[PDB]
Design a protein around this ligand. Structure first.
Ligand code: CDL
Ligand code: PC1
Ligand code: PEE
Ligand code: PEE
Ligand code: PEE
Ligand code: LPP
Ligand code: HEC
Ligand code: CUA
Ligand code: MG
Lengths: 60, 92, 90, 47, 48, 100, 145, 100, 80, 61, 92, 131, 186, 49
């Protein structure tokens, strides 16, 4: 019984540890995509059937 | 239960607490036996003149080394920020 | 109890575990409060956690840092290896 | 840039942005854990 | 309508076991001598 | 001049000096639709006060273009010219507080 | 004072000997004041020689903004920026107010720690003598030994 | 006769939930420092100034908002051709006399 | 549930109706009726409307009257 | 694909690196196209290469 | 009577490291405080909106009366509290 | 007030306010392909962008949901009607990055590729000035 | 777990106890038709589900998941600038929604975002600090972390001072190289 | 106890990919710095067809 109970604990909490090991990486990479960046140029992209329209600022 | 009313009474856990009188148990006796092997009572405390000499001489040496310890503590916490720790460079 | 084999909880804390139904409820409540607290005390707090001058430097950080500092490796590691794009063609 | 023939490209290929590098490394970081999960479980599929 | 309360700056000497940072005090003397002294006086401060 | 001058005066100024950066009021979300609608409403209110020829209102249109795709602007600009744009109806002819 | 006033549009430059403790906030008030000059609030217009400062009582101080980047060169090489000069002159004026600050705090440390040990001795003593009283048993129709 | 739920479950969880929602919202506002003073009006400053002029008598009563802008759309040009504020005011004055 | 006693302490019978003679005052009768049928239903039934009404009508002073003297930038009159 | 070409060189230098693309056909019509050619493209490509050489000499100046 | 109130060092969040001030294109060090002004103004946006609103309300008044000092002092106190938490980390 | 509509001082002094240019990018048909073009990926008008620059891409869909995908740039954003999604990018190397629509959009979902060419900033400026 | 019906089961007081569970377990049960049989079936269920050690692991997981879930819902309603339950601001044009704009910046800077963004150097080899500097001030300036993310990042050295090439791959050295060629500003 | 052999076998095989990933990151750091494959001022716009 004692040995079996420990295995069952591991059957549950070894996966839990792995998930926790991914959690921090997941937060960081999500934060990275959603970062306020000092962008200096804008390209507008519209999708139509069936082609892609692109609007870009013209040099003055 | 009954907290905050005229019916206030000791909870069961406070009553179980007071049921543990620890009679016959002495878990700190080892410290007293060991302190008694220093023979401070037979040598200093028992006689009044010697008890006075322990308070005086022990207060002279205790005061000095207490100061010494806390001086070193201070010299360490404030390392690099004390006048002695930063010799001054004269302008050319 | 967090990350606790409940067989151990049953053995070492028999009186706290006597009512197993109540014990189960506390298990749920404790972990519910932990999840709730994480969102509003670790993630939500605004304008906090941006003190990058206070990066924790553990005892292992210093062991490895001093070892490399004693030798020239720390200086060599920090040195910029290349700051030009093109090599010169003889 | 463009697909090339008979390429595994496990986790991605030819990044040209810092984010693209991030994506490739995130997959590479988890890949050994996936192998461990698979190998450790499959080894015990037996009588 | 009391004057805005000054913020709580983290000076070194504010802790119980901390001293006045002599390196900063030395620089402070230079600032006082070259800037503040033109208009203010420190009558009760002596060189000794 | 002041370092925090952009935030002072209005939150609008921030994107006016940096047209291709996130607006403080909408930087939390990737979807920028609401940002486009605010910018268009601001162009509409500028013309009512200053006219179309004013350089300010012309720039408020450039700012609107920075976040609004052309196909949306052309449609919304036609509604505005007719007098059916809901973002430009004069406030005393709005019905938002009527019957509820 | 008259000469100083006549040189500062009637305003008197206060002696800085005890100024680090003569204002609410103490040292913080010096640091804040020297770094608290700002453009006047909207609707506030200041005459020549009057400058706005958020921490001076009233908002308008006759002191020109005193700290400008590069005003002096520190002998030790520390970068000379307005905020550094402020932090440093505030430190110095705090020292000038009470030059015995360090002796006071080193002797205080030795007193406070010793007082804690003293508290523990008088507490053991108090607990001892009062045991005689707090464990007595007075009986009337009963006897237990 | 055996009970499954709280003796006053319906009122308890209804009013109770409302109370927790209201209290939590106040706490959230305090932490973010949100202004809690309700304004029922639009914030277009130029418009609110024109409205004060009407209340002060500087602009005649019942003057439409499109009679005051520096750019008019097509539908408002149509309306301006039939607008007679002076006649409208006289009509209102006649109604008041009849009523009294 | 928890077995409890009947909490009605009022009069269990008024006697036979004889052209409305020897009967309590009307308000006493209304009170006895609600005692007999339970005040929990009264409180429960009226609670929802009382809450909604109190909140809406409270705006007469909290949202309207107070507000008239709330705006700190309104008491100031221009050209004064 | 400059990073695929760099990483292939690095891997090959370190140890045994084998690419399927190197040994096998990439399309299934290879069984029939042993002698197939597009002669119109050949003439056009040769002409463009000749023009490119002239442009290169001009650019060198 | 004294310049400061004493506190435990664990309550005094002193900078644990030093980040040197940035250098300008000219080569003159830029004031850390000036660089921190925009960031701290954003943290006090709510008070800044109140101040900006006042400015526009006093701008309309056709008389010459109207000030926005009250709202500026609240914004300034807020911006400065933010600066205090991180300025000494760039100062020696 | 005029100041409720913030505008940079240069434009108030007569500087030209920038215009915008729109172009359509279409797949090159099978019969129109040239000897070296990549089938199913080539387009008749490419999108040129400068390298080593922060660029904000605002992506939406006019009629149905498309998806703008450039695998080399690590971008896959759904072009959904009603949502103008912001995507920030910083290209590090020159080249031509090919992608395809990644949301079933109708009959020719497989025939609207995405070609982006990244060039040096000096080259991009010359291109933009001419085109 | 007792095996004789004569031996009582201990129960705490409250809303989730052995007594509370007994009162409600057999409410819908056709099988608990008498005291002896009812108690036997009740103890059978309690023994099987509440005296099972591994079952408590799932109790922890449901609590944790539900707590996160309730809180994320509440947080959106209470703080997200784009979620409207009150209508005052929705009865105004976008430029006039000042009370709702107040939620924007505080919501843009959550604690975990500030704490974890510096650790991008554990996922990016070249210019991991490419987006650190921003002159506007809506977000804090970012400083790269000194250590790898704890866990499965064995491919990178535990501390970045150990890495030989780390400094030469920074956006600052890359800017130096390209600026020396006149290639680009960044 | 046998299941431990699987853990160790899965830790060895996983470590092989860790080493490959480790070498990959070293190579990537040298691409933009030293690799001749990296070319600048090279790609020219094609132009509209
Ligand atoms: C000098 C003074 C100066 C001024 C000082 C001012 C101070 C403040 C004053 C205000 C008061 C503050 C009070 C604070 C403390 C209150 C403590 C208290 O007693 O509260 C509990 C009290 C009652 O709670 P309770 O004690 O649990 O109830 C006891 C029951 O008797 C327990 O018995 P029960 O549970 O057995 O009850 C019976 C129960 C029995 O039921 C059951 O058996 C259970 C049945 C459940 C299932 C039901 C099935 C579905 C329904 C079927 C039937 C449907 C019929 C209707 C169909 C409609 C179709 C359209 O039946 C029901 O309850 C439900 C069935 C009946 C019909 C339901 C109808 C629908 C309800 C849902 C909708 C409600 C919203 C409607 C909105 C309008 C319409 C859209 O609740 C309140 O008073 C409400 C909250 C009060 C606090 C918040 C107030 C906020 C605003 C204050 C503003 C004040 C003015 C300020 C001015 C300031 C100026 C400066
Ligand atoms: C204005 C627009 C609406 C108009 C329509 C309104 C419709 C609702 C009208 C309901 C009337 C119900 C009549 C019930 C029959 C009474 C018969 C009779 O004579 O009984 C004699 C009987 C005689 O008593 P008894 O003989 O039955 O006594 C019973 C035995 N003991 C003594 C033990 C109790 O007494 C009564 O009148 C009992 C009934 C009283 C019921 C009172 C109900 C009030 C309903 C209105 C609520 C108003 C709420 C206002 C807001 C409150 C805010 C908190
Ligand atoms: C019965 C008596 C009469 C009662 C009459 C009530 C009438 C009105 C009822 C309306 C619906 C109920 C909610 C009432 C909310 C009142 C306070 C209020 O206005 O809240 C506003 C506030 C946000 O407002 P804004 O300022 O516009 O947004 C700012 C940026 N986010 O919204 C809320 O808090 C209310 C909406 C959410 C309600 C529920 C609480 C949120 C969490 C839900 C969790 C769901 C998962 C399961 C939970 C299980 C239990 C833990
Ligand atoms: C034992 C466990 C704790 C060990 C110690 C942990 C610890 O102290 O970590 C500190 C360390 C910061 O240290 P430094 O970066 O060196 O200094 C800060 C510089 N600005 O913190 C971390 O690494 C981050 C820890 C994050 C824990 C997150 C917990 C979960 C939060 C919510 C996750 C998302 C939930 C779902 C979505 C919610 C949306 C609202
Ligand atoms: C109330 C008591 C206050 C005591 C006090 O001021 O303690 C002084 C000092 C704390 O000063 P900090 O600045 O917080 O130190 C930070 C780390 N260098 O505390 C100590 O010296 C340690 C605590 C007292 C120990 C006494 C031991 C006596 C027996 C030997
Ligand atoms: C399915 C099984 C589930 C078992 C339970 C799993 C719970 C996991 C919780 C892990 C929490 C780690 C991060 C802590 C916050 C942190 O480091 O966060 C770091 C930050 C910032 O730290 P620094 O600024 O000092 O760097 O901390 C704070 O700002 C305050 C944090 C307060 C946290 C209170 C709420 C969480 C309480 C958790 C109690 C239970 C912990 C159990 C651990 C095993
Ligand atoms: C060196 C950098 C300094 C320091 C540390 C101070 N000053 Fe001045 N100061 C001047 C004048 C005319 C006044 C009086 C203003 C008025 O009340 O009208 C002051 C005032 C002060 C104070 C006290 C503020 C108050 O609360 O009373 C302090 C702490 C202070 N100063 C410090 C004039 C000048 C100068 C004339 C050009 C110069 C230079 C300085 N001060 C410089 C410094
Ligand atoms: Cu478009 Cu698919
Ligand atoms: Mg999809």
């Amino acid at each position: 019984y004692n040995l079996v109970m420990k295995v069952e604990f591991l059957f549950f909490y070894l996966p839990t540890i792995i998930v926790f090991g991914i959690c921090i990486p997941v937060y960081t990479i999500n934060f990275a995509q959603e970062e306020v960046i000092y962008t200096t140029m804008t390209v507008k992209v519209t999708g139509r059937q069936w082609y892609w329209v692109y609007e870009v600022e013209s040099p003055t | 239960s009954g907290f905050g009313t005229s019916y206030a009474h000791d909870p069961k856990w406070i009553e179980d607490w007071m049921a543990r009188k620890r009679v016959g148990v002495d878990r700190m006796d080892w410290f007293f036996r060991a302190f008694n092997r220093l023979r401070l009572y037979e040598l200093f405390f028992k006689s009044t003149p010697r008890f006075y000499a322990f308070m005086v001489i022990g207060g002279l040496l205790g005061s000095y080394y207490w100061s010494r310890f806390w001086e070193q503590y201070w010299i360490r916490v404030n390392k690099g920020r004390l006048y002695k720790d930063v010799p001054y460079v004269y302008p050319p | 109890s967090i990350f606790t084999p409940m067989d151990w909880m049953f053995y070492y804390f028999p009186n706290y575990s006597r009512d197993k139904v109540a014990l189960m409820a506390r298990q749920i409540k404790i972990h519910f409060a932990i999840g709730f607290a994480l969102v509003f005390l670790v993630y939500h707090p605004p304008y906090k956690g941006a003190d990058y001058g206070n990066f924790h430097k553990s005892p292992l950080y210093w062991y490895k840092y001093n070892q490399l500092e004693r030798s020239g490796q720390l200086q060599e590691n920090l040195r910029i290896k290349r700051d030009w794009f093109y090599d010169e063609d003889p | 840039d463009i697909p090339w023939p008979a390429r595994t490209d496990w986790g991605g290929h030819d990044p040209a942005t810092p984010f693209a590098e991030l994506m490739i490394n995130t997959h590479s970081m988890f890949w050994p854990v996936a192998i461990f999960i698979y190998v450790s479980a499959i080894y015990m599929v037996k009588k | 309508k009391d004057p805005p309360s000054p913020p709580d700056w983290p000076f070194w000497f504010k802790a119980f076991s901390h001293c006045h940072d002599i390196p900063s005090c030395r620089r402070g003397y230079e600032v006082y001598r070259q800037v503040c002294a033109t208009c203010h006086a420190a009558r009760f401060v002596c060189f000794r | 001049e002041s370092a925090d001058a952009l935030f002072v005066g209005t939150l609008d100024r921030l994107t006016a000096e940096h047209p291709h950066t996130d607006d403080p009021r909408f930087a939390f979300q990737s979807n920028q639709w609401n940002n486009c609608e605010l910018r268009f409403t601001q162009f509409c209110r500028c013309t009512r006060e200053l006219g179309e020829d004013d350089p300010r209102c012309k720039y408020q249109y450039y700012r609107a273009q920075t976040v609004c795709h052309e196909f949306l602007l052309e449609d919304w600009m036609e509604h505005r010219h007719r007098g059916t744009c809901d973002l430009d109806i004069m406030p005393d002819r709005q019905v938002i507080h009527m019957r509820g | 004072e008259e000469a100083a006033r006549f040189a500062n549009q009637g305003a008197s430059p206060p002696d800085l000997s005890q100024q680090a403790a003569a204002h609410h906030g103490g040292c913080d008030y010096i640091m804040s004041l020297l770094t608290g000059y700002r453009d006047p609030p909207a609707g506030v217009s200041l005459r020549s020689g009057l400058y706005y400062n958020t921490y001076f009582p009233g908002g308008a101080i006759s002191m020109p903004p005193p700290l400008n980047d590069g005003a002096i060169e520190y002998e030790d090489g520390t970068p000379a920026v307005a905020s550094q000069m402020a932090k440093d002159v505030s430190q110095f004026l705090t020292w000038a107010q009470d030059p015995q600050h360090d002796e006071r705090k080193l002797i205080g440390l030795k007193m406070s720690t010793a007082a804690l040990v003293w508290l523990f001795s008088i507490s053991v003593w108090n607990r001892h003598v009062w045991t005689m009283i707090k464990t007595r048993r007075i009986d009337f129709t009963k006897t237990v030994y | 006769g055996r009970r499954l739920l709280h003796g006053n479950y319906f009122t308890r969880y209804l009013f109770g939930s409302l109370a927790v929602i209201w209290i939590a919202e106040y706490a959230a506002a305090c932490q973010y420092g949100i202004p809690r003073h309700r304004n029922p009006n639009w914030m277009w400053s130029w418009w609110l100034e024109k409205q004060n002029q009407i209340k002060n008598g500087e602009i005649p009563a019942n003057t439409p908002g499109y009679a005051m802008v520096k750019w008019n759309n097509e539908a408002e040009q149509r309306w301006l051709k039939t607008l007679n504020v002076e006649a409208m005011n006289e009509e209102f004055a006649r109604r008041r006399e009849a009523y009294y | 549930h928890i077995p409890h006693p009947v909490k009605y302490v009022g009069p269990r019978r008024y006697g036979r109706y004889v052209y409305g003679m020897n009967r309590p005052p009307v308000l006493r009768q209304v009170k006895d009726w609600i005692d007999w049928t339970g005040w929990n239903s009264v409180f429960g039934g009226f609670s929802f409307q009382v809450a909604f009404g109190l909140m809406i009508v409270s705006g007469v002073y909290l949202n309207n009257y107070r507000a008239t003297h709330t705006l700190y930038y309104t008491n100031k009159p221009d050209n004064q | 694909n400059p990073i695929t070409r760099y990483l292939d060189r690095r891997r090959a230098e370190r140890g045994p690196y084998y690419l399927m693309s190197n040994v096998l056909p990439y399309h299934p019509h290879f069984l029939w196209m042993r002698n197939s050619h597009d002669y119109e493209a050949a003439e056009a490509l040769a002409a463009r290469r000749e023009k490119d050489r002239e442009l290169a000499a001009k650019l060198e100046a | 009577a004294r310049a400061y109130c004493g506190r435990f060092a664990f309550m005094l969040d002193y900078p644990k490291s030093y980040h040197p001030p940035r250098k300008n294109e000219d080569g003159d060090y830029v004031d850390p405080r000036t660089d921190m002004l925009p960031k701290c103004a954003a943290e006090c946006s709510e008070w800044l909106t109140e101040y900006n609103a006042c400015v526009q309300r006093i701008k309309m008044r056709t008389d010459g009366r109207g000030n926005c000092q009250g709202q500026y002092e609240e914004f300034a106190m807020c911006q400065d509290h933010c600066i205090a938490h991180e300025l000494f980390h760039y100062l020696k | 007030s005029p100041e409720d509509y913030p505008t940079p001082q240069k434009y108030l002094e007569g500087a030209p306010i920038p215009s915008w240019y729109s172009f359509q990018s279409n797949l090159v048909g099978d019969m129109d392909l040239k000897p070296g073009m990549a089938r199913m990926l080539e387009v008749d008008k490419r999108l040129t962008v400068p390298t080593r620059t922060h660029i904000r891409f605002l992506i939406t869909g006019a009629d149905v949901i498309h998806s703008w995908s450039v695998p080399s740039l690590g971008i896959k954003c759904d072009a959904t009607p009603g949502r103008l999604v912001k995507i920030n990018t910083f290209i590090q190397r020159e080249g031509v990055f090919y992608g395809q629509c990644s949301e079933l959009c109708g009959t020719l979902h497989a025939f609207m590729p995405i070609v982006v060419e990244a060039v040096s900033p000096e080259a991009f400026a010359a291109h933009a000035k001419k085109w | 777990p007792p095996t004789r019906l004569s031996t009582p089961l201990y129960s705490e007081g409250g809303a989730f106890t052995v007594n509370w569970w007994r009162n409600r377990y057999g409410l819908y049960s056709r099988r608990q038709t008498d005291p002896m049989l009812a108690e036997f079936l009740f103890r059978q269920q309690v023994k099987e589900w509440f005296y099972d050690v591994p079952s408590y692991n799932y109790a922890a997981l449901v609590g944790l998941a539900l707590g996160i879930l309730v809180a994320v819902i509440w947080r959106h309603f209470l703080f997200n600038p784009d979620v409207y339950v009150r209508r005052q601001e929705l009865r105004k044009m976008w430029p006039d929604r000042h009370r709702q704009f107040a939620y924007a910046v505080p919501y843009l800077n959550p604690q975990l975002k500030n704490l974890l963004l510096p650790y991008k150097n554990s996922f990016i080899d070249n210019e991991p600090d490419y987006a650190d500097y921003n002159p506007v001030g809506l977000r804090p300036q970012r400083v790269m972390a000194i250590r790898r993310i704890p866990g499965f990042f064995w491919a990178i050295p535990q501390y970045f001072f150990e890495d030989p090439l780390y400094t030469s791959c920074s956006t600052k050295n890359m800017q130096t190289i390209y600026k020396k060629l006149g290639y680009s500003e960044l | 106890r046998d299941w431990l052999i699987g853990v160790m076998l899965g830790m060895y095989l996983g470590n092989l990919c860790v080493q490959q990933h480790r070498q990959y990151r070293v190579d990537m750091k040298l691409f933009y710095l030293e690799a001749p494959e990296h070319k600048i001022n090279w790609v020219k716009p094609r132009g509209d067809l």
